[PDB]
Amino acid sequence: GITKASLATESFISAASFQETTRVLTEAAVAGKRDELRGLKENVIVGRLIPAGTGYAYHQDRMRRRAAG
């Protein structure tokens, strides 16, 4: 279901937004989860260019530079 599928998000910062914050922070912190951003909501929170729209030319030219030479 939509409300169920919304629960699963790689980025934990994103999950801390619309879900129960208290649980999310812990449940992520135990596994030492590493949020790479890559999504809209997270980049909105952290206050940098959205990985879409105009910013798609940014995050792209970045994303490929990452995990590479």
Partner: peptide, 20 residues
Amino acid sequence: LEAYGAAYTLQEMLTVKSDD
């Protein structure tokens, strides 16, 4: 803002115009 392609409008909205 997200629906349009405006990243810079949004960034300037929640960063420079306000919280930074």
